[PDB]
Nanobody
Framework: QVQLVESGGGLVQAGGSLRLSCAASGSFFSINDMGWYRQAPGKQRELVAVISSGGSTNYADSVEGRSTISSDNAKNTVYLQLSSLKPEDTAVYYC????????????????WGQGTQVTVSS
């Protein structure tokens, strides 16, 4: 089994900063990439930021310049740091991990967390 544990959500004030963390645990061989997506009601889910095993990253235009996604590979965990919060940042945030469960196979599984509400109030 593979389990994603998301932390850091809740009610926050506009203009502040937040940190979300996502930890992968269970039995697996390797994690190809991990990161965060978000979905607000009535809106499409969108990428926020993702980090690959080797350290390459990609950021949505919404957060480029005011965020950092980082990893601690030894503990299969990623962190999103986000400043300058605005009401438009309100959403359910979802951790995603793309994982190879077995050493001898290319095939990957895409795990999505339960999601954590972030509500930015003014």
């Amino acid at each position: 089994q593979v389990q994603l544990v998301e932390s850091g959500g809740g009610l926050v004030q506009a203009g502040g900063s937040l940190r979300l963390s996502c930890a992968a645990s269970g039995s697996f061989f390797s994690i190809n990439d991990m990161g965060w997506y978000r979905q607000a009601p009535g809106k499409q889910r969108e990428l926020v930021a993702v980090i690959s095993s080797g350290g390459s990253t990609n950021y949505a235009d919404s957060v480029e310049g005011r965020s950092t996604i980082s990893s601690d590979n030894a503990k299969n965990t990623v962190y999103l740091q986000l400043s300058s919060l605005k009401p438009e940042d309100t959403a359910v945030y979802y951790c995603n991990a793309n994982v190879r469960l077995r050493e001898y196979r290319t095939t990957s599984y895409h795990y999505w967390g339960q999601g954590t509400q972030v509500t930015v109030s003014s």
